[PDB]
Design a protein around this ligand. Structure first.
Ligand SMILES: COc1ccc(CN2CCOCC2)cc1OC
Length: 150
């Protein structure tokens, strides 16, 4: 009973979370997941500022109201070569990664590793935070409040 959460640097408090190395988070799960990091789904404004500080990914993830990819460099296989916060317009499917926003994080680039999941609750899952540098933090708990996300 294990969940891997790959996380990134924070940029103006915004970061990306990928669950189990696949697009596998629902919108409800994403809000609960960010809540476990004492975080919220970023607003479009928060994501734009994060982008201006150096944030980009090549993965669709939830923000408040939309599913986006922040892009700095145009890459043909990431957000169809677009730059800026690319908004997913048409998709059949509902599961993506998520972005999260931690208001207490540093204002610009914070590429230190994540060493806690401070607001997860009691549960049976071994949740492992996997940083880009491989370092890991694991704890037994749960963050999913909606049964259909479990
Ligand atoms: C040992 O099994 C479990 C332990 C804890 C939980 C999570 N809680 C969270 C609060 O509400 C009740 C369940 C689930 C479990 O089995 C699916």
């Amino acid at each position: 009973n294990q969940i891997d959460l790959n996380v990134t640097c924070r940029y103006a408090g915004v970061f990306h979370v990928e669950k189990n190395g696949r697009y596998s988070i629902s919108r409800t799960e994403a809000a609960d997941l960010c809540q476990a990091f004492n975080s919220t789904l970023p607003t479009m404004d928060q994501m734009k500022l994060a982008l201006s500080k150096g944030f980009e990914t090549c993965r669709y993830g939830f923000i408040e109201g939309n599913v986006v990819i922040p892009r700095i460099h145009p890459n043909a296989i990431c957000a169809a070569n677009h730059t800026g916060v690319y908004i997913l317009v048409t998709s059949n499917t509902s599961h993506y990664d998520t972005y999260c926003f931690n208001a207490s994080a540093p204002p610009e680039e914070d590429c230190t590793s994540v060493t806690d999941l401070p607001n997860s609750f009691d549960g049976p899952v071994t949740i492992t935070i996997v940083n880009r540098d491989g370092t890991r933090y694991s704890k037994k708990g749960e963050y999913r409040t909606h049964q259909e996300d479990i």
